[PDB]
Design a protein around this nucleic acid. Sequence first.
RNA 1: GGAUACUGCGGGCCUUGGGACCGGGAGAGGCCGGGGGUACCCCUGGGGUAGGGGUGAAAUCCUAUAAUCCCAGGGGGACCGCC
Length: 127
Amino acid sequence: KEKWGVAHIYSSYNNTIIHITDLTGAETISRWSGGMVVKADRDEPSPYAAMIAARRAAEEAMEKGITGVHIKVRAPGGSKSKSPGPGAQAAIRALSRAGLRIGRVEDVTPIPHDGTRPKGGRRGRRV
RNA sequence: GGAUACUGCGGGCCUUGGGACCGGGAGAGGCCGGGGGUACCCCUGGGGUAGGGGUGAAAUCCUAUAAUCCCAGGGGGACCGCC
């Protein structure tokens, strides 16, 4: 029989997390970060690191018996940035190549109807 | 002593300036009461294993008394995105 899961991707300017669950999101299957596959902190969001972690997670999922997968991609959002990083697309293509079938794709970046104050300081960062 | 255009004083008239009223509409004008929208933070439960965050690069910091991440619930305070 064909079973479907869900891949949550959390992408940032500093790391990428790929997490595969069942359709309910209450049972976890695999979880891999860009910091498990490199040793430089400045490479955690490299799309190659993302590809590698995606491959590991996909192979573990297949071993567990997962065939299809829906996708929810996310940036931190809220008061932080609303734009994903560059590892998300890499991870998606890597999941496709690993051998899983892909279903729906959606963005779930949480966005403020009007909310809290960000960290700048009325003048932002000045480096 | 004389004159009466202008100004002042006294008395009548006018509607052009201003004010009052009727009508159908506009608008984030103000105050009061009620109902909501996402997001964020804390707590409690379930899943899961080793890093998460952060930078020009890093480290102080959180983490094995189980973090980041995913799910189900409870509470609280500010704000009202796109249009």
